[PDB]
Amino acid sequence: SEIIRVPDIGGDGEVIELLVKTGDLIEVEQGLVVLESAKASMEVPSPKAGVVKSVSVKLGDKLKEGDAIIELEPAAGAR
């Protein structure tokens, strides 16, 4: 599996709400969370089709570039 830390933004990212659960199988396409920026709102969908294995962040909590968000478990192989 691989963990997904904050992407390349250039400042501080803040979590507004978490619309995902643990053990939930997402798909490369749907959204995952909504971070905020100095003067703009961004989004973070599922960068990998797998099931939520663990969570290293909380909703409403603020994190800085380099902070891990969640870990997707795509298993060994798929299809």
Swiss-Prot record:
Lipoyl-binding domain span: 1-73
Modification type N6-lipoyllysine: residues: K39
Highest taxon listed in the record's lineage: Bacteria
Role of this protein: The pyruvate dehydrogenase complex catalyzes the overall conversion of pyruvate to acetyl-CoA and CO(2). It contains multiple copies of three enzymatic components: pyruvate dehydrogenase (E1), dihydrolipoamide acetyltransferase (E2) and lipoamide dehydrogenase (E3).
Subunit comment: Forms a 24-polypeptide structural core with octahedral symmetry.
Family designation: Belongs to the 2-oxoacid dehydrogenase family.
Record's protein name: Dihydrolipoyllysine-residue acetyltransferase component of pyruvate dehydrogenase complex
Organism: Azotobacter vinelandii
Lineage per the UniProt record: Bacteria, Pseudomonadati, Pseudomonadota, Gammaproteobacteria, Pseudomonadales
Shown residues within the full chain: 2 to 79 of 638
